[PDB]
Design a protein around this nucleic acid. Sequence first.
DNA 1: AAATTTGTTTGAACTTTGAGCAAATTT
DNA 2: AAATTTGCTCAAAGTTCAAACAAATTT
Lengths: 98, 91
Amino acid sequence: MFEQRVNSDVLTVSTVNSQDQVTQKPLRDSVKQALKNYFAQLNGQDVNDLYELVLAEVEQPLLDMVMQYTRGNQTRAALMMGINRGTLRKKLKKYGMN
Amino acid sequence: SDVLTVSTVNSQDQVTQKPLRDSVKQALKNYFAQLNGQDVNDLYELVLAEVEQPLLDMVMQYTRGNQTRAALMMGINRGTLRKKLKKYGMN
DNA sequence: AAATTTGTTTGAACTTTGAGCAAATTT
DNA sequence: AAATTTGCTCAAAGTTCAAACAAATTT
């Protein structure tokens, strides 16, 4: 057959391990790391917009990368992400990618 | 100046931060590399799923389970948070 | 000159929100 | 015993959507 590829390992980054060998951990794990790192560096300072902070840090490069792929075609890009053409264009405005 | 970041090692064994947005690119760069014009259909709800999950995973761990502190921390409604927790089944 | 995409608008379908309250749980 | 948090449900506020369709651009 084909071999399973869990959604965990659909999107993946390159890491180095204890034996200095290149392996591919999930993006999940990068996100986890970053948050662990963000809390530790926080020091009892108040936070109240973590969702939008993360979302910004993820939408931008998804958009960046997807528009490169469709050589700048929105209809394709929006179809490709699964979102209305108008909201893509709204998101794009928000980060100044138009 | 950039708050969301991850650690990296160079060949000369030095650790060093880089923004998470640089990871997300790589992932996508890689996702697209390994497709070969196979249609992609629902990519926004995919990455979102791969980012919501460990964000919820970590903020509950941080707020010791406190749904209320968690929502307030994330800047979303207390009900939205319940719904997202059903979505990935983290009851 | 043919097809396809942009840039808009419209209204309907859906989602998030703030508040309210009893009942359960933590302090 | 007091304070806070859960689990719910209403409504209003806000976003996403598909569909139009000229006007611009690309095949």
